[PDB]
């Protein structure tokens, strides 16, 4: 969504996909899933069983 709205604000035939791409929401989404979600439970190891 940010990419599609930012290509309008960028100029024409003078930009590159490296300038286009912002991986911050992807990595933020991964870390906010691994923390702060009850399906990413703390590992429970009293014994191998």
């Amino acid at each position: 969504r940010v990419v599609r709205e930012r290509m309008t604000t960028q100029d024409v035939e003078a930009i590159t996909p490296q300038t286009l791409i912002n991986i911050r929401p992807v990595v933020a989404a991964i870390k906010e899933f691994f923390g702060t979600s009850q399906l990413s439970q703390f590992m429970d190891q009293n014994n191998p069983l």
């Binding site: 035939e13 003078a14 490296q18």
Partner: protein, 135 residues
């Protein structure tokens, strides 16, 4: 200008080493797509050979062009048009810009123009541009 192994300078993305010509067709029309290995971050560009002179990607300048940017550097609104003066493509209009981020791009692309027209050992040759800064 558009052959195998040339050194053709894009007016915005810098100089690229063309490796090969491809006839990658657009609906049955085998357009002469020419590859471009610009060594900034290797954003590989396949441009048509016919539209290459449409967009104005040009060959490297010579020693006469080097002396032209030297004589522009000899004698040192305005700010909006001088940024647009980089977008002209003429090498005597790039050297008017160097005589704050816009000044950063103008100096580094002149040395890439300096060290490929003459092939004289690049960005350490930015110090050579510092020599002709006083001119």
């Amino acid at each position: 200008i558009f052959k195998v192994g040339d050194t053709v300078v894009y007016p915005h993305h810098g100089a690229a080493l063309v490796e090969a010509i491809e006839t990658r067709t657009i609906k049955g029309e085998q357009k002469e797509y020419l590859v471009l290995k610009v060594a900034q971050g290797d954003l590989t560009v396949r441009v048509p050979a016919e539209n290459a002179e449409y967009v104005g990607v040009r060959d490297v300048v010579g020693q006469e062009g080097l002396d032209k940017v030297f004589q522009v550097l000899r004698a040192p609104r305005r700010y909006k048009a001088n940024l647009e003066k980089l977008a002209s493509g003429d090498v005597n209009k790039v050297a008017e810009v160097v005589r704050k981020r816009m000044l950063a791009k103008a100096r580094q692309i002149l040395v890439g123009e300096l060290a490929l027209a003459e092939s004289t050992d690049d960005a350490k040759a930015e110090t050579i541009l510092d020599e002709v800064l006083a001119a």
